[PDB]
Structure 1
Amino acid sequence: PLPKSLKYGDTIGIYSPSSPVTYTSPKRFERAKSYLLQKGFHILEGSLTGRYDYYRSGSIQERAKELNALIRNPNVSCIMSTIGGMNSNSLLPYIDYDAFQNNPKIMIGYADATALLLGIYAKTGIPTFYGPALVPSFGEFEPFVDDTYKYFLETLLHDQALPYNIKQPLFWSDEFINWEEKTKEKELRPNNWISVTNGQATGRVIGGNLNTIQGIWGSPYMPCIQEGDILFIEDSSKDAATIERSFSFLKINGVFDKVSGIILGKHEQFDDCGTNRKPYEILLEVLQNQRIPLLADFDCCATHPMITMPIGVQVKMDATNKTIHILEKWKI
């Protein structure tokens, strides 16, 4: 069971499972919609679009209803979060997994939406996509939005012969500017994926936003991590203390006794608490010299631009030579 590839003229349904961004950042929201409309995709606005309930878009029931309406709509080919926040996991008991399994669609987003991407995969076995959310990703100004868009097409729309090589972008940024309105150009940071621990691994890739995983761990909505899986994790806009807790959470759960390799995303606006340590160095301390191939600063996180990564399919990573290939089909 796999979702159909996106096509020009398709409808993308958008929903707000957590923060009410369509109310609080209307300019970036409108820009994001226009960007995709111009590319050739229709936008179906979920029922909580424009609504405000302070830290969230609406009640648990209303958010589940918003998403379920899109799941059940045969005219929708792709379901995309508007943004994350903290509260997507509240929806999980109430989602119509059977409707999704009977008519698979592309489910895409990142950050807090991890709860839903992993929950849908766990319940249905259908691959989901760690990738753009409407407002942060497609509301981005030039130049980075165009790079994110190229990666979006590469994974969801283009015919891709396997293995599918995921290529490193030339430049990136995590600069905290140009949210609603553009005031200057973001700096172009020359890119590098980091060969932290050499080696190669092949296996099913599982993961997403690590902070968010801790809100679903142990539940029926968290796919079981199996011996030989590849772990993909990122955090964004946290600090050294928080990520040490999260890395140790994985360690004490035996995750590093099972996975064959680790892909670690860049950490947007990382606060190192004065230590001058990088996120991978904190992970290395937690690993205590266990030799697991580890490739870091992967561009699939809150930094721009963003790759669209299938979750739940076989991948091969090479931490030595800094490559990632998708080995198993993820769409029709």
Structure 2
Amino acid sequence: SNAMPLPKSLKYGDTIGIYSPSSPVTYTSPKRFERAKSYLLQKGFHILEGSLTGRYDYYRSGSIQERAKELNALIRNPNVSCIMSTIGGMNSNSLLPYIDYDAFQNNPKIMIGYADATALLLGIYAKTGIPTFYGPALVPSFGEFEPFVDDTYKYFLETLLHDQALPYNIKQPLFWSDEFINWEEKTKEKELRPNNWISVTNGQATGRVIGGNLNTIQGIWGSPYMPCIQEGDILFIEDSSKDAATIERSFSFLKINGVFDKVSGIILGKHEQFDDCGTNRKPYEILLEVLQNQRIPLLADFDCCATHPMITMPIGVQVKMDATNKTIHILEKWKI
């Protein structure tokens, strides 16, 4: 494709602006928040704390307007190179009418996070055409204790700071965990589980990658903030800390919307703490029942989700997925 506007690569010493578009984690998990800030500051970055840092409004950090103001102040700040959510929740989609998309277009930045922040990552991409990044959120990702934080950090740097020739291979982490331990304070080492990606349905696909947190997508679907899925796209989806009933509903939502008629392939994230409801079924098994007799190449248990460690994935650029050989390559530039 033609060259297009892209955000500048991260540099050592850059300022990362943090915001809380949903849950008030900087108030309710202060130890993990301070540890995450300290992790990035020790690496040499600066943190600009958004205006709702340390505030509390129960399930959220502040009103819809206050949250949009917090993010906009970062978007408008020429000194901020990267805008990172603190954590998700459920309420990022409330901000969408109020975001200064023109200011973001004027001065594109690296916009990164995951989970509920998908509303914003996809909304900015839909409105501006600037790739956004499914990747670390400050508290969950950078407040993780060693060792996994260091793997997350390495992938973050490799994708956002280092020069990469194309095609850029996204390597499989060697070890992983989803254990529900060590949130504020560490009580034992997480298990270093040997990692694998899963060749659910063989084949290859090449196309623009679209997606993120599937549950969250259902809060933006049909609006101007959801990029339209096009023939040949590769669908990236993950859910975390849900159950079999919920994810069947979301998979059937995609099916009845025709999404599976369009896409060339599917990348499915690991599903942190999945509740199978007694079925013993894996998330991909439920998805494949919904697919019925339609064969689609599918690579599952991809490490770009709430499990540790986490890959940083550009969204809105061409990718090659090889479900048979379990490879993912980025084929188009995502930063300058």
Identity %: 100
My pick for the range that moved more, 286-295 or 41-50, is: 286-295
Give the C-alpha shift of residue 188 in structure 1.
1.1
Residues 232-259 of structure 1, C-alpha deviations (whole Å, 9 max, x = no match)? 0000000000000000000000000000
Residues 70-128 of structure 1, C-alpha deviations (whole Å, 9 max, x = no match)? 00000000000000000000000000000000100000000000000000000000000
Residues 112-146 of structure 1, C-alpha deviations (whole Å, 9 max, x = no match)? 00000000000000000000000000000000000
- Residues in 1 aligned to 2:213 and 2:68: alpha-carbon distance in whole angstroms: 21
- Residues in 2 aligned to 1:195 and 1:189: alpha-carbon distance in whole angstroms: 19
Give the C-alpha shift of residue 189 in structure 1.
1.0
How many residue pairs align between the two structures? 332
Give the corresponding residue for 1:91.
95
Give the corresponding residue for 1:162.
166
- Residues in 2 aligned to 1:62 and 1:236: alpha-carbon distance in whole angstroms: 27
Give the corresponding residue for 2:151.
147
Residues 262-287 of structure 1, C-alpha deviations (whole Å, 9 max, x = no match)? 00000000000000000000000000
Give the corresponding residue for 1:26.
30
- Residues in 2 aligned to 1:316 and 1:226: alpha-carbon distance in whole angstroms: 16
Give the C-alpha shift of residue 173 in structure 1.
0.2
Is 1:125 aligned to residue 120 of structure 2?
no
- Residues in 2 aligned to 1:208 and 1:330: alpha-carbon distance in whole angstroms: 17
Q: Among 310, 319, 324, which residue is 1:315 paired with?
A: 319
Give the C-alpha shift of residue 327 in structure 1.
0.2
Give the corresponding residue for 2:105.
101
Residues 146-178 of structure 1, C-alpha deviations (whole Å, 9 max, x = no match)? 000000001100000001100000000000000
Q: How big is the alpha-carbon RMSD for the aligned residues of Structure 1 and Structure 2?
A: 0.3
Residues 8-42 of structure 1, C-alpha deviations (whole Å, 9 max, x = no match)? 01000000000000000000000000000010100
- Residues in 1 aligned to 2:37 and 2:168: alpha-carbon distance in whole angstroms: 29
Q: Secondary structure of 2:122's match?
A: helix
Give the corresponding residue for 2:236.
232
Is 1:262 aligned to residue 266 of structure 2?
yes
Give the corresponding residue for 2:116.
112
- Residues in 1 aligned to 2:180 and 2:114: alpha-carbon distance in whole angstroms: 18
Structure 1 outlier segments of 4+, above 2 Å: none
Give the C-alpha shift of residue 229 in structure 1.
0.2
- Residues in 2 aligned to 1:300 and 1:98: alpha-carbon distance in whole angstroms: 29
Q: Secondary structure of 1:146's match?
A: helix
Q: Secondary structure of 1:324's match?
A: strand
Gaps in structure 2 of 5+ consecutive residues: none
Is 1:177 aligned to residue 158 of structure 2?
no
TM-score w.r.t. the length of structure 1 is 1.00
Give the C-alpha shift of residue 289 in structure 1.
2.5
Q: Secondary structure of 2:53's match?
A: coil
1:1-332 correspondence runs (5 A): 1-332=5-336
- Residues in 1 aligned to 2:250 and 2:295: alpha-carbon distance in whole angstroms: 19
- Residues in 2 aligned to 1:165 and 1:41: alpha-carbon distance in whole angstroms: 26
Q: Secondary structure of 1:304's match?
A: coil
- Residues in 2 aligned to 1:311 and 1:277: alpha-carbon distance in whole angstroms: 29
Q: Secondary structure of 2:121's match?
A: helix
Residues 274-329 of structure 1, C-alpha deviations (whole Å, 9 max, x = no match)? 00000000000000031100000000000000000000000000000000000000
- Residues in 2 aligned to 1:305 and 1:109: alpha-carbon distance in whole angstroms: 14
Q: Secondary structure of 1:85's match?
A: coil
TM-score w.r.t. the length of structure 2 is 0.99
- Residues in 1 aligned to 2:115 and 2:155: alpha-carbon distance in whole angstroms: 18
- Residues in 2 aligned to 1:289 and 1:272: alpha-carbon distance in whole angstroms: 23
- Residues in 1 aligned to 2:191 and 2:170: alpha-carbon distance in whole angstroms: 24
Q: Secondary structure of 1:301's match?
A: coil
- Residues in 2 aligned to 1:93 and 1:280: alpha-carbon distance in whole angstroms: 34
- Residues in 2 aligned to 1:72 and 1:325: alpha-carbon distance in whole angstroms: 33
Q: Secondary structure of 1:238's match?
A: coil
- Residues in 2 aligned to 1:4 and 1:298: alpha-carbon distance in whole angstroms: 27
